[PDB]
């Protein structure tokens, strides 16, 4: 026997994730990641408060 072996890509697995690789490592614990905008708003009101 050989523990069952034909490869990485034979049904359906890679979107728990997306990616970016990360080789060089050795610097973070609880760093950042961003974006820079927010969520829809104001042209129904009165002349609202």
């Amino acid at each position: 026997n050989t523990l069952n072996f034909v490869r990485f890509l034979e049904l359906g697995l890679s979107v728990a994730c997306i990616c970016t690789k990360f080789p060089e490592l050795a610097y973070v614990r609880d760093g950042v990641i961003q974006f820079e905008v927010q969520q829809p708003m104001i042209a129904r009101d009165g002349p609202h408060p």
């Binding site: 610097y27 973070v28 760093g31 950042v32 990641i33 961003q34 974006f35 820079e36």
Partner: peptide
């Protein structure tokens, strides 16, 4: 202000954040 030849659709570029050295 200079913001006037300015996007007319799905504005398609990049997004900033900060690897803290």
């Amino acid at each position: 202000i200079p913001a006037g030849i300015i996007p007319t659709g799905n504005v398609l570029s990049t997004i900033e954040v900060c690897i803290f050295f």
